[PDB]
Every structure is written in C-alpha cells, then in structure tokens.
Amino acid sequence: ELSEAERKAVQAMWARLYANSEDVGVAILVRFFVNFPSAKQYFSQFKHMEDPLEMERSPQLRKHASRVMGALNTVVENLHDPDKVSSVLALVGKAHALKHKVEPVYFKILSGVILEVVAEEFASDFPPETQRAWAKLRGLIYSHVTAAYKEVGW
Amino acid sequence: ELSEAERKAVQAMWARLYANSEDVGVAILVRFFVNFPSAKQYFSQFKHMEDPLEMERSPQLRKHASRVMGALNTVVENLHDPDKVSSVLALVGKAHALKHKVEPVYFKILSGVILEVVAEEFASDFPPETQRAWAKLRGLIYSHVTAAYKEVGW
Numbered sequence: 001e002l003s004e005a006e007r008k009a010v011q012a013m014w015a016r017l018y019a020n021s022e023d024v025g026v027a028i029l030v031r032f033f034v035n036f037p038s039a040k041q042y043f044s045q046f047k048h049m050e051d052p053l054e055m056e057r058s059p060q061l062r063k064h065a066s067r068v069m070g071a072l073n074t075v076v077e078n079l080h081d082p083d084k085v086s087s088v089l090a091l092v093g094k095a096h097a098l099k100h101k102v103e104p105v106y107f108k109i110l111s112g113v114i115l116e117v118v119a120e121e122f123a124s125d126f127p128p129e130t131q132r133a134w135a136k137l138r139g140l141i142y143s144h145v146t147a148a149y150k151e152v153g154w
Numbered sequence: 155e156l157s158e159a160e161r162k163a164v165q166a167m168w169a170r171l172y173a174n175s176e177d178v179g180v181a182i183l184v185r186f187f188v189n190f191p192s193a194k195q196y197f198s199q200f201k202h203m204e205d206p207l208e209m210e211r212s213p214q215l216r217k218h219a220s221r222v223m224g225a226l227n228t229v230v231e232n233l234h235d236p237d238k239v240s241s242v243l244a245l246v247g248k249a250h251a252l253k254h255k256v257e258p259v260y261f262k263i264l265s266g267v268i269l270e271v272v273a274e275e276f277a278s279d280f281p282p283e284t285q286r287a288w289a290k291l292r293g294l295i296y297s298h299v300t301a302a303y304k305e306v307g308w
C-alpha cells in the first residue's frame with residue numbers, strides 16, 4: 001500500500017534514526033517500559049526495574065533495542081520487495097506468539113511510542129507526506145504481525 | 155494503596171496543571187489521537203482528522219478534554235476518600251463499557267499518554283518520588299476502571 005515517494009520518505013527518515021541506532025532504540029524502549037510498565041513483564045532480566053537511568057544501562061534492555069532496530073531496518077530496506085517484508089514480519093509475529101507469548105496489542109502500543117519519539121527527535125524532517133508514509137508502515141507492521149498470530153492459533 | 159506524602163505530591167503537581175487544564179487536556183487528547191489513530195473510531199466528528207492543529211479546534215475533541223480533566227480533578231481532590239475516588243472511576247468505566255462501547259485497553263493507553271505529558275510539563279523538576287506517586291495514581295485509575303468492565307460482563 002506504500003507509494004514510491006512514501007517508501008523513499010520512510011527510508012530517508014529511518015536513515016537518520018538508525019544513524020544513532022542504539023541511542024534511539026533505547027530511548028524508544030525506555031519510554032515504552034516507563035509509560036507501560038506492564039510490557040516489561042515479558043522480560044525476565046528487567047521486569048523489576050523502575051528507574052529509567054537503570055533501564056538506560058540494563059543488559060537485556062539494550063539487547064532488545066539493538067535487535068529490534070535491526071529487524072525493523074530489515075523491513076525498511078526491503079520495502080521495494082513486499083515478499084521480503086511479509087516473510088520478516090511473520091517471523092517476528094510467530095516468534096512473539098510462541099517464544100515470548102506476548103499479547104499482540106503491545107505491538108500497537110510500541111508503534112505509538114516509536115511514532116512520538118520520531119516526532120520529537122525529527123520534527124523538522126517530518127512533513128505531512130512522511131507522517132503518512134510512517135503511519136502506513138505502522139499499520140502494515142501491525143497487520144502482518146496480527147495475521148501471523150492468527151495463523152498460529154491465539 | 156497510596157501514601158500521604160504521595161497524595162500531596164500528586165495534588166501539588168495537578169493544581170499547577172489545572173490552572174491551565176484547557177490546553178493540558180487538549181494537549182493530552184491530541185497526542186493520544188495522533189499516536190493512536192484507532193482511538194478515533196469512537197468519535198464521529200473529528201476522526202477524519204490527521205493534523206494536530208485541526209484536532210485542537212474540534213469541539214467534540216475539546217468537550218471530551220474537559221470531561222477528562224474534570225473527572226480526573228475530582229479523583230485528585232478526593233484522594234483522602236478512597237471510597238469516593240473508587241466510585242467516580244467505576245462510573246467512568248461502567249459508562250464507557252456500556253454506553254460508549256470502548257475497549258478497556260485504550261484506558262491503559264490514554265493513561266500512558268497522560269503520564270508522558272505530565273512528565274514533559276514538569277521536566278525541570280520531576281524527581282523519582284513524584285514520578286512514582288503519579289505511576290501509583292495511574293495504575294489505580296486503570297485497575298479500578300478495569301474492575302468495572304469485569305463487573306458488567308466484559
């Protein structure tokens with residue numbers, strides 16, 4: 001559903017984020033886990049953290065961030081190829097249904113946190129056209145992930 | 155569930171906020187709706203809106219900001235009366251379940267947007283102990299509303 005311009009606009013914003021990838025990744029997760037403590041129950045090495053400075057150093061915190069960014073990157077780079085995005089987003093879907101038993105609405109919650117951070121850090125580089133492209137990428141991530149949860153039971 | 159020092163902390167911050175409750179309520183609802191566009195399905199008058207500048211002028215949006223600020227202001231003033239806070243929250247949660255047919259997860263979500271925005275208002279002065287007084291208030295709101303939804307068969 002993404003146009004060529006919307007594609008290019010996502011890839012171009014993404015390149016700015018991922019220039020400072022782990023810094024952005026951990027800002028995203030720290031805002032996520034602070035504002036939604038319930039999401040942090042799934043992570044056995046920091047279910048018990050409350051102080052954001054401590055989250056901004058927790059081993060298994062910056063692991064999830066680095067490999068989360070890494071898998072999202074794999075999506076953005078391959079937006080020219082819808083077969084490739086489908087395949088990736090199902091692996092992420094299935095893994096989270098099966099391996100970590102995460103309620104699928106948390107994807108929706110985390111995407112809203114991703115959006116707010118991108119809006120803060122790159123307000124000036126975020127015109128209506130990009131806001132649209134980002135929104136469509138978000139719905140796509142959520143749809144494919146949601147389907148990979150149905151395909152497996154849930 | 156909430157300590158006396160903690161109630162005074164929440165009442166101090168809230169009072170400073172209520173002096174400008176019009177813009178604070180709208181700031182919160184607009185962030186809510188931009189960051190979680192699916193929460194707009196329930197409001198037929200904005201909903202077709204994407205621009206935050208447009209959203210802050212929508213009367214359905216801004217009526218609902220006052221409703222939200224008003225209910226939350228009578229939870230905060232009555233934190234000495236745990237039976238009063240509890241009754242007000244049951245009512246909001248019973249009403250939104252039955253009349254407004256709103257999925258209870260959006261209360262999780264909006265609570266986190268409220269927290270995000272309090273945290274940005276008092277960024278200069280927001281030490282760990284005020285943080286968690288707000289987080290305790292937050293969870294109190296959420297579980298009381300959730301308990302009402304359970305009470306009516308949802």
Ligand code: HEM
Pocket residue numbers: 039040042043060063064067068069071072092095096099100102106107110141
């Ligand atoms: C854009 C959406 C997401 C992406 C791309 C993503 C990516 C990943 C990846 C690549 C891994 C490592 C491989 C694996 O364990 O399967 C992982 C681990 C994990 N994720 Fe996600 N994730 C996302 C959303 C979420 C959400 C919303 C939660 C709920 C809190 C969550 C909870 C977890 C947990 C508990 C682990 C295990 C960490 C560990 O075992 O050390 N994920 N994630």
Ligand code: HEM
Pocket residue numbers: 193196197214218221222225226246249250254256257260261264
């Ligand atoms: C602390 C959280 C909330 C409070 C205190 C609150 C309070 C209120 C109040 C007082 C009203 C006026 C009607 C009535 O008395 O029930 C109202 C209307 C309404 N609310 Fe909420 N609300 C909250 C959260 C939400 C959320 C998260 C949603 C959507 C996801 C929502 C959806 C609606 C809708 C659809 C209406 C009526 C729409 C209209 O005809 O204007 N509310 N709310």
